[PDB]
Amino acid sequence: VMVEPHRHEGVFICALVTKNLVPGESVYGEKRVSISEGDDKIEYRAWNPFRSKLAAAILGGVDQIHIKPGAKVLYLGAASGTTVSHVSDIVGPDGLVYAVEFSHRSGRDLINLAKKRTNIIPVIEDARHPHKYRMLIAMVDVIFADVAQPDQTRIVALNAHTFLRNGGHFVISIKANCIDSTASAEAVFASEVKKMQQENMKPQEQLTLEPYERDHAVVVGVYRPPP
């Protein structure tokens, strides 16, 4: 058995891989591995931690990612869809990934990616203005955010208050010098964690991403809003 289920459902090893929702096709040139046994066949896609902060976090030993089969995911800052494609593999056909990205150039890549993946909804919009797209987004189980803005906690909190179920979870990427380049990484991460707590986004774990990225954190937690 050459590829084993990782601890996280929907992830596998052998080197992280996910199960390819679109057998035969690569998204960004990644290695694909197909295994056949009699009539049976299954393909996996390599998941590069130098291109995907979520992969870096999984190889770094994150306890929970909450992105799992059947999950509904709001992905803020989807860029051209590199990580989104693996999220799509993980949540599978009964899951959903809204890919919010404000660049029209990257949006074109996301639209091309979603032609083959029925579980991706490209939302080509500024995540600071969720009122512009709130009629497209059903309540989600998880928010993944990589918007890399000084005000990203406020941005993520606003989307959470609008779209994230009570008891749902969040996975937030924090690049310290995109939030405040004159502060130390520790000061940025502490300040962001503090701000998250004040929005009822309760961190349950936080880790950095060395050796894949410098001064880059991932914070995972649970959203527990008031009545």
Interface ranges with ligand 8VD (CB under 6 A): 77, 79, 100-102, 126-128, 146-149, 155
Is 217 within 8 Å of 56 (Cβ atoms)?
no
Least Cβ distance, residue 26 to ligand 8VD (angstroms): 21
Q: Is 4 annotated as a binding residue?
A: no
The residue (of 17 and 127) whose beta carbon lies closer to ligand 8VD is 127
Q: Is 208 annotated as a binding residue?
A: no
Least Cβ distance, residue 81 to ligand 8VD (angstroms): 11
Q: Is 148 annotated as a binding residue?
A: yes
For residue 72, give Cα distances in angstroms to 34, 132, 186.
27, 20, 32
Tokens of 162: 């609008």
Q: Measure the CA–CA gap between 220 and 14, rounded to whole angstroms.
A: 25
Q: Is 39 annotated as a binding residue?
A: no
The residue (of 101 and 141) whose beta carbon lies closer to ligand 8VD is 101
Identify which of 99, 183, 190 has the alpha carbon closest to the alpha carbon of residue 153. 190
Alpha-carbon radius of gyration of the chain = 17
Q: Measure the CA–CA gap between 169 and 79, rounded to whole angstroms.
A: 21
Least Cβ distance, residue 102 to ligand 8VD (angstroms): 4
Q: Which residues contribute to the annotated binding site for S-adenosyl-L-methionine?
A: 82-83, 101-102, 126-127, 146-149
